[PDB]
Amino acid sequence: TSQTDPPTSIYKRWFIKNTQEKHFELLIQRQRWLRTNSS
Amino acid sequence: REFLVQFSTLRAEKRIDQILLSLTHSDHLSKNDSGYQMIEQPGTIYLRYLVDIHKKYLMNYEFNTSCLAERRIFLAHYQTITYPSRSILVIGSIGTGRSYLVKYLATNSYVPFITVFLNKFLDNKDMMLEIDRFYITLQFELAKAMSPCIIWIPNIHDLSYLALGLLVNSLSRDCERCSTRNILVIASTHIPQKVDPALIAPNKLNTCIKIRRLLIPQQRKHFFTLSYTRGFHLEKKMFHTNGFESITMGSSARDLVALTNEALSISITQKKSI
Amino acid sequence: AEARVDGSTGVKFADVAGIDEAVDELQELVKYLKNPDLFDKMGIKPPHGVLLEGPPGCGKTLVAKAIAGEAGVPFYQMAGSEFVEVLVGVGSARIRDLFKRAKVNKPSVIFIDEIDALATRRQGINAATQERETTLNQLLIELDGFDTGKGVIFLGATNRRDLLDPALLRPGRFDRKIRVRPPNAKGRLDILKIHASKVKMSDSVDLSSYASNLPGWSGAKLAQLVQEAALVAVRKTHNSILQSDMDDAVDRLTVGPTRIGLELGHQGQCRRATTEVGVAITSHLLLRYENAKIERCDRVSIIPRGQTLSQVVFHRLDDESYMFGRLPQLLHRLQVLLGGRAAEEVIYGSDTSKASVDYLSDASWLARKILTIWNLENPMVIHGEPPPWRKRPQFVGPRLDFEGSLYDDYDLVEPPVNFNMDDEVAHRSEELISQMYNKTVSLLRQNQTALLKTVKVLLNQKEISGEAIDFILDHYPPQTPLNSLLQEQNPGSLPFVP
Amino acid sequence: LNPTVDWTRETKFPHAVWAAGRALITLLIPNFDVVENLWLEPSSWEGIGCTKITKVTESRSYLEKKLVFCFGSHIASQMLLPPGDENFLSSSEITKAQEIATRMVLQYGWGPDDSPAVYYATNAVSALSMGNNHEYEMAGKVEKIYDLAYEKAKGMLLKNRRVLEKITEELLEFEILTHKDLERIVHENGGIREKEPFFLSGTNYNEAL
Amino acid sequence: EYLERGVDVKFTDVAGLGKIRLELEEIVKFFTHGEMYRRRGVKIPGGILLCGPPGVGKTLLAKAVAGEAGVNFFSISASQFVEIYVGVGASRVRALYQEARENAPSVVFIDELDAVGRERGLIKGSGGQERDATLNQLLVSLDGFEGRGEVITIASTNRPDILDPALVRPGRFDRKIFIPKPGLIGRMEILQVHARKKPMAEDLDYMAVASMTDGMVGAELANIVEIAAINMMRDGRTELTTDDLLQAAQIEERGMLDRKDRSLETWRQVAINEAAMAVVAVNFPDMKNIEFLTINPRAGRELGYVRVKMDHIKFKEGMLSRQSILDHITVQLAPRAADELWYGEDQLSTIWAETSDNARSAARSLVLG
Amino acid sequence: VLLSGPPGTGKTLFARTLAKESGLPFVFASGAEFTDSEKSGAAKINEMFSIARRNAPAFVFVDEIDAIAGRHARKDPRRRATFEALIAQLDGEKEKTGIDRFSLRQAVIFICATNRPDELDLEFVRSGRIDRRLYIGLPDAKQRVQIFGVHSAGKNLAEDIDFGKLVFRTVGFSGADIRNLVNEAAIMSVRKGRSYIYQQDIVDVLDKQLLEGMGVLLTEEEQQKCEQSVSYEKKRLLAV
Amino acid sequence: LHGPPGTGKTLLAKAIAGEAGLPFFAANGTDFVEMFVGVAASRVKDLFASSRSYAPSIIFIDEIDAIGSKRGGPDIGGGGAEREQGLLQILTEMDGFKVTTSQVLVIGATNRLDILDPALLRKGRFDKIIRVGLPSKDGRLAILKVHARNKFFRSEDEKEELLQEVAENTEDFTGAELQNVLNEAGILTARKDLDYIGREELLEALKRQKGTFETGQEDSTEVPEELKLRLAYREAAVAVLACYLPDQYRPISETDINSIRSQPNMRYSETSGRVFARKSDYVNSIIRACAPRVVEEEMFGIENLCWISAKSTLEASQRAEFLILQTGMTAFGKAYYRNQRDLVPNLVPKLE
């Protein structure tokens, strides 16, 4: 998943905005768990 | 099928001896230290006042406008009722039980008590409209025919447009004429936040009342009164002392009724009256 | 199905104004309807269907009627919602009958208004849905079966292009997609001239000013404005629509009609007066001193109108200055937003009120868009944040549309991972907000006589104009003592007659 | 219908102290709302004690007055009710005070240092970013203003202890109270009222021009 | 009812086939040399499924293979099977397969199985029950009991992942053919075969045209042909040339060119941004080949644009170096720095607020990738 | 009276011994067919209650009531009509039923059985409508030996047959399970040509039933070849 | 009868019908359902009365899962009511089977189980619930030698050897897949006009039936030298790390650099029997997991790492996490942790 259609202009992006959303959610949940289970 | 069973409730008029029997009712054990003192319940007391004034054709002489005396007497009576709505909404179905109060007050009422079910107006789905309109007009015409009558309407949260129009027209027209003004249109439900504000008018279905769950002394008093009315003398050691206060629960309706039925059946099995 | 076969629709391109780009584009279809053989000899395939997309009131139906009248061809107008019934299959039969009737009278123009009712997308967010699908499939089959040389032109009008089925947007069904934009200032001027040609007009009415001062108004809204002004003139027993009638109709449509003596106490009114006068005074001072590229206060009112207890009319600048918003302009607009609370602090001491918190909200968001979304400062940030509260751009409330909108992130937000940069950004935002608030309080405190005089004048007259505020500023230079204002016979009196 | 508790002396004391504290914290605050009647209703589901107070855009000082008023019943129960006799009746006022503090720190910008930063709006579903190390500062400010309100209420209610005791006794013996007898009580018993300006912290107060 | 008349599409009428055409004539062999297939102990594969992007001509392919087979053609929409009531769909597919059976030899076509081929248990409703009933009825008609060897089904889906595992089981849908996006030669052939029906010049090199419309479907090539038919009345020239098709490709790639009133400093700002973009784009191997650089406003993009075409093979395979990305972020940081180098840090504009977000997103993705 | 418990325990057996011991008419029906169609949804309830009433003192026994008074009886109005009719019939309340509450014509007990008592509505198990609750559990060791003796009487069991040593292999079994075990023992004894049923017959039947659980359906030759397929070094580890 | 789809349920039903020589009644589940209620019951009762009239009989009902669907939600459309009415009617037909007069046997076939309500599975309706699943290796030989009777081969011995080796190379495939690869090899031979099923024909049929191709495009693309170089270096690194750290059960067979994949194009010789695997095997797996990144960082540096060559140490870290948490052979402890929620915050720094 790396936006297999190439951009004809440099204004366009190289990877889709919703490609890495699972990793962000996992990191956010891990950080929230660490914060909540420490006080 | 409900019309044939509601038309056949009072096929013949009540016997004159039944009228004279029912007209002379009494207090029946209110001022007893064991059960149901006078202060404990104002709602059923007000309901009994409404039924008793309904019994003597006393809504028909609504007011006098007389010179000085009759007006003052009727004013004092009007005050002493509330501390004259012809149709009462009740909302107390947060706990359990609707029959246990209204058929409790209806046995002394002696007036034909008719229950119309709104759910029959929903299960009929230009012909359905004609059937519903004819059915409801026949219901109201019959309720006029056997006047005086007490109409109970359970679960008004169910109500569709035809019955709403019927009730709006009935409350608009049958409260300033149609000389049988003593027609109780009492109705019950469990959702008071759903009814439209067009049905809470002072002329149409006002003065709501509420019922709460039974407290332990209230449970004791209700148990004693339920046991005494069938000829069973309760033992004078557990209400005269703290005997059965520590065992009884079922802190709601339908529990004291079932417990009384069970205990009376058990005492019947041993041929006992205590 | 009475598809009105009118030989002359009564509408031509002379009745269409401000839609000049779409008129120029559709002149090709008008020419093709005039001489289809000219397109035939060149091997030119005409479009099967044309989609007119745009906001309601822009006269897409009027444009189609103008095309039909100019071409002199039969015109079959029908709404899409008329194809949606309870019985399944009636709409497809109506579609087939309409297409057959159009094919009988060639050349012809078919027009379907509100096609989004039939072509609603199968969103993944009764038998009516099946009927709509069958009618849409019948429409697709009819459009795909069209021969280009038969001279029948299909038009579909829509207000929501997002709800349309992408199958219709494929080539061969809707080849041309023309966006009917709202008319410009010249277009609104022409539309106002056309609608005022039908009603007795006074020579004192300048249509150019109302064309320039009402951006985004459709032709239908301008017609409603003219009709409401005529109704006001009838109510006022005027023989013709005066400029006062135009202004009254404009105020009725924008901020609503005036009430009848519905006023609160003096305490809750002086606070709103202080807020609005402080905002206007701050804007005028920023215009006067640093030559800010900001808007101008036209008039201020404190009479309740519609649902607003007070208002400050702001003159909208040209759109060419609404794209390259630089840092000084945004900082000056932040100062204007904070000017209300600055006025409450310099006038009412340390006992402020709620009436200045609303502006205090917007500034508290705007600086964030300076630091995260736009990234104007130069410690670079890693992620933006979405606005927790969203408020629609609107009338007499402050502009907040300098970059098109204030509470609309351009999909430039990412979820955070590190939480220390978040508190660093919060600290920087608090520092910037406090610095700008201190600056606008220092600016407003240096001019106290003008602010208090404007407050008293607005409290007495219940309305004031921007030129009156400018005259107050001219007559009251900076650092005048307050006893000069307090010694006047009537503080709420202005000797200027506009 | 039937009241949930009998009409005795022990049960009425927490509600009498509650209503008397509400009445005293209403009367002592200048330019505040005015009480009409106080009574102890036996069959009221809200509570035995009942108080009717009618109010006289709201400013910062009115919100500070309300925050001070929200502690009156709890402080009255603290000084008057014996240890071992705690109160759950004043919890709703405590939660309201905590709500008022976080509102006037975050929303309106009326912080302890008068900061115009706004983190919440009336239409908002959440707050701003607020970081991780900056929420503790906001919590410290909210605790500071809450403690200032509690200290102010305690200071203005410990000066009229005999007044509060007399109001409790008279409410207990009469069961119906007007405004005139409360004015008599705060007059004869040496009721020291407060005076304008009313600030929750006088270290930052300014005056209008 | 579900039968069509006048089928004449052949392999010549369709373009850009490639070795798929070989598989296509296999179907022709399956319809012509079938006696030799049967004598070698081979069962005829009754299930072929064409999968690819929309607009590749799946219906056109079905019509072509039906015409070359020389048998009766059935083409039915799958949305007709789904009904708000249950039972009619199973009867429709039963009657469909029955009339296909009696019309043997014949080939049938059913398009967009994604409406009726969904998994059993993804939606809880009566429509899902009807879908399950129709899916089971077609399952039992395709393989369920003995008695069909001469009817062949043809399927055309855009999303093959929604297909039921029961259907793709061997014996029901065994042959899976992917029709991809046309490359180079397919675009030439599609443009020429759509352009036979229009008078055309002999100097028309379509190579540059197809080199502009990279990665576009055959329906989009038909659209490019469609913007090469009318628009010439404004100039009024003689014959279709190269530049007209080049401009049509530019229009269908970006949008209509519109001119509006403007100031001089606005043009200077936009041209400075485009200059920074192009100047930084020059100095890197990842986007060195620059073709166009303009500042004209278009539909949806007031700002200018630049065009670069490096070989599109590394992006598909994913072989992009770290230095390939770290340069691109620098390119996306080309505008803002130019502002800092032209108008000062105190007067930064807001035009680069989009490319700067792309740079930070690319940096985050490279860090967590 | 509400009967609950695991399926196949014989609640209808209790109902029938109740009918036989009482010597009274006994109306027996099934609850699966009461939500039949649109011809008569809730009319069957009225008919079966009236049939009981016309021959009172009598009883009414409906099997698997969970299809009528389930938690989804209110979402569907078709189930709701039958549920409301059922609730109306079990009370007195002369209006809409047209009969006196206290008479010979009301001596009818509503007997209901189910398998998941937690799926029933609260208003049906509410006191007054359902008074007694009986949970019939699965049998035990000695009861399973007696059930095996009852269901394995008319078969030629050999001299090595004893079910007392195979009780622990049948924990949780009902009467139907033991009957199926006896039948499968007869089948397997026929399978090898054995004239009687051996203890090894029942042991191999139970072993086959256990090995079929994990998805191993192999004959002897395939099992032996697969055992010979593995090596010896990797078998001693499993052995240890 | 049930199990995985395409295993031979209906084929076994046809075998039952042929072998029995008894009155056989084949029916389909979806045949009975329409809008109008009661017609399903009428059809199935005509079927059951017919079966009773010509008793003894075998009634086979294909695809019971259509009518047999459990109530999985509110049936607004009303088709579920008809399905339930038909279901209860057929259950009454099964319960009406008296053991003295009805020698009628019901044989079913379905592909799913959780959609069926637990009502048909009651005793006296469906006593035996048999599942026919994927056959063993001997079953694979049996089904292919059944399926390879009409297929022409060069000789019997080469046919036997080739069918045996493709049986060893068709693991986790049903009989439908085996007859499909045989039929596709026949198709390939018929296309090439070869009278006997060749070796490459079977290999190509198996290759297309295991779904190696996914692009489905014309394979003619100029591959750059900088792509073949990276592929060859990656393959050489994998070969060196595999030869230096050998695996007892997976030896190297071949290596090619012709296809682009996230994982290397390596092939190993599978040997079943992995009863035991020590901690050194886990360590060697962790080492061999992170091969493509190190070679490109050594020869080409850090500024030339590809996207598919940088996603290699993630797999090594995952294998290290598996070794630490779910083996108990490390010093982390001797417990077994499933990663989601039984990881106390004390153990997090130790794991890291």
Ligand SMILES: Nc1ncnc2c1ncn2[C@@H]1O[C@H](COP(=O)(O)OP(=O)(O)OP(=O)(O)O)[C@@H](O)[C@H]1O
């Ligand atoms: N054991 C076997 N021996 C020979 N052929 C087999 C065997 N098992 C399956 N087949 C092949 O499978 C085909 C029939 O599959 P079957 O009808 O049993 O699948 P199914 O169980 O009905 O799947 P579904 O329920 O999805 O239709 C036959 O054509 C046959 O060639």
Ligand SMILES: [Mg+2]
């Ligand atoms: Mg049962």
Ligand SMILES: [Mg+2]
């Ligand atoms: Mg099958």
